[PDB]
Design a protein around this ligand. Sequence first.
Ligand code: A1B2N
Ligand code: ZN
Length: 139
Amino acid sequence: SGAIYVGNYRVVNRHLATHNDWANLVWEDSSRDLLVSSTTAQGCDTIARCDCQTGVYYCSSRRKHYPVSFSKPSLIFVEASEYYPARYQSHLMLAVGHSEPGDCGGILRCQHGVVGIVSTGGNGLVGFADVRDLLWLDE
Ligand SMILES: CS(=O)(=O)c1ccccc1CC(=O)N1CCC[C@H](C(N)=O)C1
Ligand SMILES: [Zn+2]
C-alpha cells in the first residue's frame, strides 16, 4: 500500500483505489494501473521531471529502502490476477530487486523527486508505474 500526495491530488495504484478515490476521480488508466483523485488538503511531494534510470524505492515487505537501476518506461506483458486479465501495461519500468504482494504503492525517488510507485514484481524483479510524464500534477 501507498500513495503520492502533490497539491490537491492523490496518486494511487488503480487496483488498490478506494470508494472515496472513485467518488473524487480526476483521471484513471487501466493500462498503466494508475488512478488520481482530488484532495481537500495540500500535498507536498515533489515530482521529478527527468530521464534518470537510478533511484531508491521503499520495500514494505522488508521495512527498508533499496537503491536500484531501472529501465525506461515501456509496454510490458503482465500475467492475469484478481484485478486484471493478462495484458500489456504501459509506462512500466523494471529493476532487479525484491518485491512481493503487499509492496504496491511504495515510492521510487531519484535526486529530482518522485519518479513512480511499485505496481508489478516477482522473480527477483520489481516493476514501477512511471508518473514523470503527468505534467498536470503540478498545475
Ligand atoms: C506476485 S508478484 O508479481 O511477484 C508481485 C510482486 C510485487 C508487487 C505485486 C505483485 C503482484 C503483481 O504483480 N500484480 C498483482 C496486482 C496488480 C499488478 C498489475 N499492475 O497488473 C500485478
Ligand atoms: Zn531524476
